[model samples]
Target: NAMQDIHFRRHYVRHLPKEVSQNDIIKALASPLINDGMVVSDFADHVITREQNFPTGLPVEPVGVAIPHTDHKYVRQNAISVGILAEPVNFEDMGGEPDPVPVRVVFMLALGESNKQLNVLGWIMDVIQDEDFMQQLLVMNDDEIYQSIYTRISE
Candidate 1:
């Protein structure tokens, strides 16, 4: 239940930049966790590696999606960070592929425990299935996209 609500609180988001790496985005949202002394040693490296192995790609639209994550022990608290690119970010395609996907959103998650991550996976699934929600994100500007996404999850 605790992990169901995302860690995002507005300040965490940085919209649409050119030439930003996954590390850049993760580090941005993770400073808060680091300040709280919550993340594992070399957690960021672990995140990148895990992404290489268990790529978290989900097929929703032409742009596609990926939720790159590691196990919960890497964090002091269970939290999820979301990044949206005005342009798609290239991610290795999961569920079978030879190349990368043009995924526009990246979700970096760290749970206090493994089971905590599982508890919220269903909610994440449900929210992403909202076609209206996904369409709203595909077409909106930074502020509008963020607001609409946060609003639906709040309900």
Candidate 2:
């Protein structure tokens, strides 16, 4: 049932250019979800603004990660999009430090319900905390990345 609630597409997993800005990265990741009608037209805008005020970059080992999202009101369905950058980009530290963290992976969440948002956030935290798994994702091809995430969250 939980798996049924989270929408993911194979093409949603991406390998992005190193020069892409943080806001551009968020927009790129949200594009497919927007096209699929999973999120509203302004979803990316809200996420971009929310990230500016409250950063989501995590200083994990091996590689850093970020989870960018907006208010659930912008979502029509629950989904997640993944972005793997060719090189790390600086995202403001989640702790609000002056120094920014170099992030290689991004997980953009689109959830319409508060309780489900908490559940998915918890799941993403589990993913972030596993350094080995995080490293594996870095080396994985697009299909592998998609399958790996789907399997992990579905179970």
Instruction: Name the best candidate (by lDDT).
Output: 2
Q: Model 1, 77: alpha-carbon shift in Å?
A: 0.6
Alpha carbon lDDT at 15, candidate 2: 93
Q: Name model 1 segments beyond 4 Å from true.
A: 1-6, 36-38, 138-151
TM-score of 1: 0.78
Lowest lDDT sum, 10 consecutive residues, model 2, at: 117-126
State the lDDT of candidate 1 residue by residue for 60-116, as single tens digits. Answer: 565467777776767776665667776777777777776677777766677777666
> Candidate 1: lDDT of 66?
72
Total clashes, candidate 2? 0
Q: In candidate 2, how many Å is residue 95 off?
A: 2.0
